[PDB]
């Protein structure tokens, strides 16, 4: 059904849209998409930070830890396991790289 509303004057009777100052559905989608794109670009303004092992999502953290388990128990620098699930290479130099 249509959401009826308590009126405060005949202007509300003549009114069709409850919020005239609000963009229509298509303009809302356009504005939301533009805002999300701008926020994403602002987030990505800096390079892709190479987060450590402990900061990876739950489905990569344990795999990386198991891959590098032996090196953790036997400590010697220069040991890196070339896992597959790690973060993808960005392609350009970054401040964190």
């Amino acid at each position: 059904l249509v959401k009826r509303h308590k009126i405060t004057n005949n202007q509300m009777l003549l009114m069709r849209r409850r919020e005239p100052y609000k963009p229509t559905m298509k303009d809302r989608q356009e504005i939301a998409d533009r805002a999300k794109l701008e926020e994403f670009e602002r987030k990505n303004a800096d390079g892709l930070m190479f987060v450590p092992e402990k900061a990876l999502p739950p489905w990569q953290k344990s795999l990386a830890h198991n891959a590098k388990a032996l090196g953790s128990r036997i400590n010697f620098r220069g040991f890196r396991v070339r896992v597959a699930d790690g973060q993808d290479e960005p392609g350009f130099p970054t401040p964190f790289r």
Binding site: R34, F40, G47, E89, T94
Partner: protein, 614 residues
């Protein structure tokens, strides 16, 4: 007895947004009608159709003008007219053209102009592993063709372009190439480009141009979305702020525009211009003839193929002895000839080329030209009487089977499919291109954007979708060269062949077609409603104009010939005949009362005036 009132007996299609809602994008085309374009995320925003009708009007460097003079290009195709302006304006662009309007030049020449501008005016330096332009193409043959078309431009303009494919030591060879020669353009598969990026053999620091030659396949799952991932990496690079501002632009050349391509481009590059001519989009050229040959059984297909080859002049070598048969099966038999010999059988040379290739003037809006010589990495070094042919099969096994069968029969054939080793594949393609073999048995490998001289295309297995069929058809019907496509079909492809035949007969686009009879028969409720409204209006017009009816019949005539009567629940028409069950309930109540009375009377008559007693 069961029901005596129906509005629409058949059932409508579940599809809502389009005719082919259920089909995947990479199997069906997308309707380009404005009604669909309105909801489309790409075709609605920006579409460029105005044209500049001369390269002289186009701002081009003398180097580019000399390059196109060498290529023999003198008049711009409408696609080039529409696309050069926007690519020079440096906007992400989607060029569409019906398989042979010059998309390669359309998206290459402006990009080379921009690269020259960057190198000279802006003086952007050239680094070792940071190329200016990345060009993407699916097949190795297309990669080589693009490498040739880019090498001519590079030799003309001082730029450098490389290309790489699968080899023995792929990693070593590619790394050696990168170490040795710094490059401006790299034509390579997106998979290899991603390999290089992940192994940080190449960098996007100085990359400014991305070009895709087959956007449909590249952005579809048919190629693993490698191009999509590469483009997302490019977008990340553009977003990156600490490096010098590079407004990387993407060009997508696509003979088809599908749901996948349009959605990807619309949702990633919102400010993407589109260059399409809906009137000639998704249709074969006008200089292409079609012949759909039915076969009683799959066995007759080989005989039909032999008949077609003999008719077009690829006569076999008659075998009459065991040694001859053995050598025919074992060793290849290349053809030989020369231009002078063919003539007996450089304006004069160009005229001979026109006559041999069937070139005819290309009739555009208000100007005409003649198709330029093909752009392939293997020139036609050998000429033979027989007409060039290409036979597309269902798969690798069918391709090799047809190849061996023709060789045994006596024809000279080449084979092309992925499973062949690198050397054999190169040799086969080189043979066919140079003309030492006038018949090429292949699969869809060669159907994706190859500029090669083929007089006709045989489909040894009729395609089930418009995409592959139209690509194979366009392989032969170039700018203005005459082309012919035969298609050997069976009972299985009846629906698709009938649909394509009707569409080609009345010259309307193959926007949605399939091999499923239910899909091609059942309408979509709103479309059926529109057609029914038009039909009712036409019937009303005919009744008004021709017939005159009395007052006591006006009501019935208008009800049954001039009124639009909407269905009850189109989603359940297959169950309730498109009529309310309540009205159906009343109708069946009355009819059942009448039928019960009639049955009682009939029983009385048959038993002697009394049913129980008789």
């Amino acid at each position: 007895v069961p029901q005596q009132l129906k509005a629409y007996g058949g059932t409508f299609s579940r599809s809502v947004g389009e005719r082919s809602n259920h089909l995947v994008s990479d199997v069906v085309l997308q309707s380009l009608s404005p009604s669909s374009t309105h909801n489309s995320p790409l075709l609605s925003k920006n579409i460029k159709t105005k044209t500049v009708t001369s390269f002289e009007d186009m701002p081009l460097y003398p180097e580019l003008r000399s390059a196109l003079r060498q290529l023999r290009i003198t008049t711009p195709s409408p696609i080039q007219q529409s696309a050069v302006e926007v690519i020079m304006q440096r906007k992400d662009t989607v060029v569409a053209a019906p398989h042979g309007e010059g998309k390669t030049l359309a998206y290459l020449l402006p990009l080379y102009q921009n690269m020259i501008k960057d190198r000279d005016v802006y003086k952007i330096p050239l680094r070792e592993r940071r190329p200016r332009m990345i060009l993407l193409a699916p097949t190795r043959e297309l990669i080589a063709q693009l490498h040739h078309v880019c090498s001519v431009l590079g030799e003309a303009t001082g730029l450098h372009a490389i290309s790489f494919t699968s080899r023995k030591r792929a990693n070593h060879r590619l790394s050696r190439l990168l170490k040795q020669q710094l490059v401006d353009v790299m034509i390579m598969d997106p998979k290899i480009v991603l390999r290089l990026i992940r192994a940080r053999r190449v960098f996007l620091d100085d990359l400014r141009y991305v070009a895709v030659d087959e956007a449909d396949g590249m952005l579809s799952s048919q190629h693993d979305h490698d191009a999509v991932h590469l483009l997302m990496k490019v977008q990340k690079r553009v977003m990156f702020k600490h490096l010098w501002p590079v407004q990387t632009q993407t060009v997508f050349a696509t003979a088809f525009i599908t749901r996948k391509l349009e959605f990807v481009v619309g949702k990633k590059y919102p400010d993407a211009v589109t260059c399409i001519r809906r009137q000639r989009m998704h249709r074969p050229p006008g200089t292409l003839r079609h012949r759909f040959l039915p076969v009683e059984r799959e066995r007759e297909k080989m005989d039909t193929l032999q008949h077609l080859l003999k008719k077009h002049g690829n006569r076999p070598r008659e075998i009459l002895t065991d040694i001859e048969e053995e050598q025919a099966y074992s060793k290849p038999h290349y053809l030989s000839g020369s231009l002078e010999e063919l003539v007996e059988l450089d304006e004069m040379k160009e005229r001979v080329r026109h006559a041999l290739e069937g070139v005819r003037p290309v009739h555009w809006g208000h100007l005409t030209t003649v198709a330029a010589p093909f752009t392939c990495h293997v020139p036609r070094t050998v000429f033979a009487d027989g007409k060039r042919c290409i036979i597309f099969t269902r798969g690798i096994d069918c391709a090799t089977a047809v190849y061996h069968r023709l060789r045994g029969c006596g024809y000279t054939c080449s084979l092309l499919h992925a499973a062949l080793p690198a050397a054999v594949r190169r040799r086969m393609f080189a043979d066919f291109a140079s003309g030492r073999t006038n018949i090429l048995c292949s699969t869809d490998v060669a159907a994706r954007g190859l500029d090669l001289h083929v007089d006709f295309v045989v489909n040894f297995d009729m395609p089930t979708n418009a995409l592959t069929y139209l690509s194979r058809a366009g392989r032969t019907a170039r700018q203005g060269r005459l082309g012919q496509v035969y298609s050997l079909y069976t009972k299985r492809q009846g629906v698709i062949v009938s649909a394509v035949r009707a569409f080609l007969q009345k010259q309307l686009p193959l926007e949605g077609i399939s091999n499923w009879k239910r899909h091609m028969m059942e309408p979509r409720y709103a479309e059926w409603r529109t057609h029914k409204l038009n039909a009712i209006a036409r019937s009303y017009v005919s009744l008004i104009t021709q017939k005159t009816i009395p007052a006591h019949l006006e009501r019935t005539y208008l009800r049954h010939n001039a009124t639009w009567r909407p269905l009850f629940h189109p989603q359940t028409t297959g169950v309730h005949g498109g009529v309310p069950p309540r009205q159906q309930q009343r109708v069946m109540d009355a009819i059942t009362w009448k039928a019960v009375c009639f049955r009682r009377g009939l029983l009385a008559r048959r038993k002697g005036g009394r049913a129980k007693f008789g």
